[PDB]
Amino acid sequence: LYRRVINRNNRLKRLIDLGAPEIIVNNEKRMLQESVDALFDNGRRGRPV
Amino acid sequence: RRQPVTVLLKALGWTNEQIVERFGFSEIMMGTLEKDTTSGTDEALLDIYRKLRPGEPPTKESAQTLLENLFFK
Amino acid sequence: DEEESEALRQARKDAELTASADSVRAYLKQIGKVALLNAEEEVEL
Amino acid sequence: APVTHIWYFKGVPSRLGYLLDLAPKDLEKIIYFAAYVITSVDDEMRHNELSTLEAEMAVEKKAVEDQRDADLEARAQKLEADLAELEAEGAKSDVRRKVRDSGEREMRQLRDRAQRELDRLDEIWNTFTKLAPKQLIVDEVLYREL
């Protein structure tokens, strides 16, 4: 789980760096939120990882 | 979510005469039919599509083919 | 009675403001706003 | 990007929901980038410059009205022009009926599109004047307009 978080947290840092369109940045932020949520409590909100 | 079966019958291609002809034995059927606000097959189809698939916008062909692939394919 | 009707318009409007809890559905439903480009507008862009 | 701890977000009850008084269904959309939320509104600035915005909105409404009237006039002129070459020939009512129906439908569409635009403009104005913090805007187009 941790690994996934880091991966996503890295990708966001790239997308913001090169100025990606707001849609992609928002999607990445949502993915990071979901990854952290599943790390703390898997399967609480959505389908478990 | 639950809804009266009369809308399902209408969407399947039944006008508001065959229901009375066939289900004339019971009284709860007539209560449901009278209480049903929807009128016409097209009206029921739109509601069924909205409820079952609220995400994407309703369309005509998709609504018509909705129940067909759901059970009869 | 299934075109430019106040009933259909309400349904179409409501269908757009849906939560779409599923993340994959949320993204796919969002990328459908922009229409596909033809050959010439690509060159122009 | 900051993230919210899942425990306090939704835990039956939602601690954030009770703290801020946003329903969990509404709070869910904010966190997962589904609808905008207003963080602050400048009431003092709005009051000092409210009438000017009213005038700037009224001018746009009048422009829309004038455009709709011009479009109606042009389409009516076209309608009267298409009855000259189709009435010289002694055809039946069907030849005349089609033009009448097309013109009537064109008038109805020209009127209702302008009515929809006016309704959208009124909605924008009403949303702006009532704008308050912690207000959820679910329509992206409306938020862009604001």
Give the tags.
part of a larger assembly, 4 chains, B: 73 residues, mainly alpha, 5 helices, 60% helix, C: 45 residues, 58% helix, DNA-directed RNA polymerase subunit beta' (chain D), DNA-directed RNA polymerase subunit beta (chain B)
Rounded radius of gyration of chain A (Å)? 12 Å
Helicity of chain B, as a percent range: 55-70%
Helical fraction of chain A equals over 70%
What's the overall geometry of chain B?
elongated
Family (chain A): Belongs to the RNA polymerase beta' chain family.
Protein name (chain A): DNA-directed RNA polymerase subunit beta'
Subunit structure (chain A): The RNAP catalytic core consists of 2 alpha, 1 beta, 1 beta' and 1 omega subunit. When a sigma factor is associated with the core the holoenzyme is formed, which can initiate transcription.
Function (chain A): DNA-dependent RNA polymerase catalyzes the transcription of DNA into RNA using the four ribonucleoside triphosphates as substrates.
Task: Note down, in words, how this protein is organized.
This is part of a larger assembly, with two copies of chain A, one copy of chain B (73 residues) and one copy of chain C (45 residues). Chain A is mostly helical and 49 residues long. Chain A contains two helices and no strands. In chain A, 22% of the residues are buried. Chain B is mainly α and 73 residues long. In chain B, 60% of the residues lie in helices and 0% in strands. Chain B contains five helices and no strands. Chain B has helices at residues 5-11, 18-22, 28-35, 41-52, 60-71. In chain B, helix 1 crosses helix 4 (41-52). The relative contact order of chain B is 0.16. Helices cover 58% and strands 0% of the residues of chain C. Chain C is built from three helices and no strands. Chain C is flat and about 40 Å long. At the A-D interface, helix 2 of A face helix 1 of D.
What's the arrangement of secondary structure elements?
This is part of a larger assembly, with two copies of chain A, one copy of chain B (73 residues) and one copy of chain C (45 residues).
Chain A: H1 2-17, H2 22-40
Helix pairs in contact in A: 1-2
Chain B: H1 5-11, H2 18-22, H3 28-35, H4 41-52, H5 60-71
Helix pairs in contact in B: 1-4, 4-5
Chain C: H1 6-16, H2 23-31, H3 39-44
Summarize it:
The structure is cut from a larger assembly and holds 2 copies of chain A, 1 copy of chain B (73 residues) and 1 copy of chain C (45 residues). Chain A has 49 residues and is an all-alpha fold.
